[PDB]
From a paper:
No interaction was observed for the reported ligand Arg1-Cys2sulfonate, NRC(SO3) and, consistently, a co-crystal structure of the ZZ-DZB:peptide complex showed both R1 and C(SO3)2 sidechains protruding out of the binding pocket.
Among the >600 human ubiquitin ligases, UBR4 plays a particularly important PQC role, being an essential and conserved E3/E4 ligase found across eukaryotes. Aside from teaming up with various ubiquitin ligases, UBR4 activity is linked to two specific cofactors: calcium-binding protein calmodulin (CALM1) and KCMF1 (13, 16, 17, 20, 21). Our data show that the evolutionarily conserved UBR4 complex forms a megadalton E4 arena, in which inward-facing ZZ-DZB domains of KCMF1 act not as E3 ligases but as substrate receptors.
Residue numbers in the entry:
A (entry chain A): 2 to 121
B (entry chain B): 1 to 4
């Protein structure tokens, strides 16, 4: 999944995939996983600063039948199997349940959305 | 940076 609206303060990439590391000392300061693990610093940030990992987790509801308690992986297998060609519009639960994610990602091809925007 |  991509951290929509978030840009890395060291390499400047935005809407990046992977884990997001937020500094709890610097104002509005985030690093992508690569910059974090490599010890990148910019402006007033130091590697001693505590950081919060923001990311995955979660159980999700299938938008087509309402069954609950899927992981991201198990949701995709369930959808790509039992809801294969359904053209009914639904809102993505993964996008809505993740921080900064799109609260109303409407899609009429959920299986394809999962494969392209929620890669495992 | 978070813009939202
Ligand atoms: Zn970076
Ligand atoms: Zn910092
Ligand atoms: Zn279902
Ligand atoms: Zn989504």
């Amino acid at each position: 999944s991509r951290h929509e609206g978030v840009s890395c303060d060291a390499c400047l990439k935005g809407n990046f995939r992977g884990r997001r590391y937020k500094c709890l000392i610097c104002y509005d300061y985030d690093l992508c996983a690569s910059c974090y693990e490599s010890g990148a610093t910019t402006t007033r940030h130091t590697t001693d600063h505590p950081m919060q990992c923001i990311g995955g987790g979660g159980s999700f509801t299938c938008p087509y039948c309402g069954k609950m308690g899927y992981t991201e992986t198990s949701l995709q297998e369930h959808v790509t199997s039992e809801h294969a060609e359904t053209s009914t519009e639904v809102i993505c639960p993964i996008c809505a349940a993740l921080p900064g994610g799109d609260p109303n990602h409407v899609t009429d091809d959920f299986a394809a959305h999962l494969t392209l925007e929620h890669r495992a | 940076r978070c813009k939202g």
